[PDB]
Design a protein around this nucleic acid. Structure first.
Ligand SMILES: [Ca+2]
Ligand SMILES: [Cl-]
Ligand SMILES: [Zn+2]
Length: 187
DNA sequence: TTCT
């Protein structure tokens, strides 16, 4: 119920405009006797801790800051939950995050993970290996489409009554990215 | 204007 600023959302989740930051919206649902129950109190968003060598802050990618906060969610380890991420950059490999998320999932088997990425972080030369590894660890790895952008707008942004207005090129970029990811996950 |  801490809501994201409209301009922060549109300037970070635009799937044609890269930024030097990462934002991550998350939601948790519990699977019970077949159907799924939304746990609206476990909803939130965060961004990465920025690098700042000067001030001796080393910097922490958004995905690991989500892992940081899981204990506070107080999940029942006998139950099974689906955690959904809407992340403005896909997770990296070379800084260790994909592997850390895999280790978290192996240990925390009560969490299943669904990732929708706005953009592919191919700045990481080994970004393909992060995506395949997350898939191999049991996560759903997907590209955000209109439905997820609107859902994040409706759910996480302080819109004040304004309906989601898709930017130019939202569908074209989502489709192109969905094509690249599918090819990556075919292998 | 790619977790600067
Ligand atoms: Ca959805
Ligand atoms: Cl990452
Ligand atoms: Zn990372």
């Amino acid at each position: 119920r801490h809501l994201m600023d409209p301009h922060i959302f549109t300037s970070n989740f635009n799937n044609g405009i890269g930024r030097h930051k990462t934002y991550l919206c998350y939601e948790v649902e519990r699977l019970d006797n077949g159907t799924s129950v939304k746990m609206d109190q476990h909803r939130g968003f965060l961004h990465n801790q920025a690098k700042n060598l000067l001030c001796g802050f080393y910097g922490r990618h958004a995905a690991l800051r989500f892992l940081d906060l899981v204990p506070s969610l107080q999940l029942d380890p006998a139950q099974i939950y689906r955690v959904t991420w809407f992340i403005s950059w896909s997770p990296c490999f070379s800084w260790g995050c994909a592997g850390e998320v895999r280790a978290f999932l192996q240990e925390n088997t009560h969490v299943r993970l669904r990732i929708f990425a706005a953009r592919i972080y191919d700045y990481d030369p080994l970004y393909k290996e992060a995506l395949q590894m997350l898939r191999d660890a049991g996560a759903q790895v997907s590209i955000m489409t209109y439905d997820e952008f609107k859902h994040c707008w409706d759910t996480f942004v302080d819109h004040q009554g304004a309906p989601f207005q898709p930017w130019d090129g939202l569908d074209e970029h989502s489709q192109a990215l969905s094509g690249r990811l599918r090819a990556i996950l075919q292998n």
